């Protein structure tokens, strides 16, 4: 469960992010010993990207390079191999997607929503690593940027976000065999840029922005009861946070609290319904991509 491949543990990788400008950092945190490693920079700076892992490879998807010399939304898919410590371009998406949400089903990467200039996407596309090919699938019922995405029981959920006019509490679910999206129970809070993940049988939505404050509240959707319930709030309000699951606990990384770009990383224990601080990143940032895979070489 803890060991992967050769004889190694798994790390929490954070890629990219934003502080003053879009960042190229790739760093990996080890919950077993508290250590941080700096790894190979992304080829192109990006905030607002998502991260995921397939076959042990780390993928960086979408985003936007906010640089003083120009701002460029990204359709880019790039893959990091922990065994070589090298980034490799993959095929690009049909469209640039900043503030994207990503989920993995059946070894396939789903890219959801996001923005391209003043365009807010409802479009969705699926990537097949064995063929290095993107194909559009059915669009969402809602245009969503800053959308959180999670996978539960081989179904993909798109949660919260912003359609261009209002921040959203709505959420919806993709059924792959019917290529069909259906709305589900909305959250009890409007959230854009929330951290969205799955733990046991629930989809969590932590933090985000409700249109006037960054949030510390956290809720989770029990798919069996189709209801949202608040759990314990985080210790920091945060928006544009990184999130992932590691050994049964939820990790939230950085974000913006309305005053500071956070370096705080918090870990949620579901058994005790408590959050603790477990480390800080090397520097404060928002809009990172986060995933978990094997230790690098
Ligand atoms: C069917 C392909 O699935 C994978 O290769 C998954 C890898 C992973 O979750 O690391
Ligand atoms: C008021 C401009 O919009 C924001 O500033 C939105 C979110 C955030 O900081 O987290």
- Please list the helix, strand and coil fractions of the chain in percent, rounded to the nearest 5, in that order: 0, 50, 50
Task: Count other C-beta atoms under 10 Å from residue 157's C-beta.
Answer: 24
Q: Measuring from atom 3 of ligand 2, which residue has the nearest CA?
A: 211
Q: Using an 8 Å Cβ cutoff, are 2 and 10 in contact?
A: yes
C-alpha 45 to ligand 1 mean position (Å): 26
Tell me which residue of 252, 250, 230 sits closest to 239, measured CA to CA.
Answer: 252
C-alpha 56 to ligand 1 mean position (Å): 7
Exp. method:
X-ray
Burial class (CB in 10 A: 0-12, 13-18, 19+), 225: exposed
Q: Measuring from atom 5 of ligand 1, which residue has the nearest CA?
A: 55
3-class secondary-structure state, position 107 = coil
> Structure tokens of 167?
């921040």
- For strands 115-116 and 119-120, give the pairing: antiparallel
- Write down the residue that tokens 């990790």 correspond to: 251
- Identify which ligand lies nearest to the alpha carbon of 99: 2
> Domain-by-domain residue ranges, the chain?
1-297
Count of residues for the chain?
A: 297
- Identify which ligand lies nearest to the alpha carbon of 194: 2
Q: 88-93: which pairs have CB atoms within 8 A and are 24 or more residues apart?
A: 89/43, 90/59, 90/127, 90/129, 90/132, 91/127, 91/132, 91/133, 91/134, 92/134, 93/61, 93/62, 93/125, 93/127, 93/134
């Amino acid at each position: 469960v803890p060991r992967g491949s050769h004889m190694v543990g798994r790390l929490i990788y954070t890629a990219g992010g934003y502080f003053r400008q879009s960042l190229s950092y790739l760093e990996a945190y080890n919950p077993s010993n508290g250590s941080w490693l700096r790894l190979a920079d992304l080829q192109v700076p990006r905030s607002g990207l998502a991260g995921c892992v397939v076959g042990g490879l780390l993928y960086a998807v979408g985003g936007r390079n906010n640089s003083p010399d120009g701002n460029t939304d990204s359709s880019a898919l790039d893959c990091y191999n922990p065994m070589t410590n090298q980034w490799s371009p993959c095929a690009s998406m049909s469209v640039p997607r900043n503030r994207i949400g990503v989920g993995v089903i059946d070894g396939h990467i789903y890219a959801v929503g996001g923005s391209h200039g003043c365009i807010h996407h409802s479009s969705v596309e699926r990537y097949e690593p064995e063929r290095d090919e993107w194909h559009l699938v059915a669009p969402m019922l809602t245009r969503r940027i800053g959308v959180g995405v999670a996978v539960l029981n081989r179904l993909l959920y798109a949660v919260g976000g912003f359609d261009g006019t209002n921040r959203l509490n709505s959420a919806e679910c993709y059924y792959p065999e019917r290529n069909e999206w259906r709305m589900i129970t909305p959250m009890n809070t409007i959230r854009s840029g929330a951290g969205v993940c799955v733990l046991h049988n629930c989809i969590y939505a932590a933090g985000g922005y409700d249109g006037q404050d960054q949030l510390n509240s956290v809720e989770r959707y029990d798919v069996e009861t189709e209801t949202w319930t608040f759990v314990a709030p985080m210790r920091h309000h945060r928006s544009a946070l990184g999130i992932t699951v590691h050994q049964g606990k939820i990790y939230v990384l950085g974000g913006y609290d309305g005053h500071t770009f956070l370096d705080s990383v918090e870990c949620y224990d579901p058994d005790s319904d408590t959050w603790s601080e477990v480390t800080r990143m090397t520097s404060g940032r928002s809009g990172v991509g986060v995933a978990v895979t094997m230790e690098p070489c």
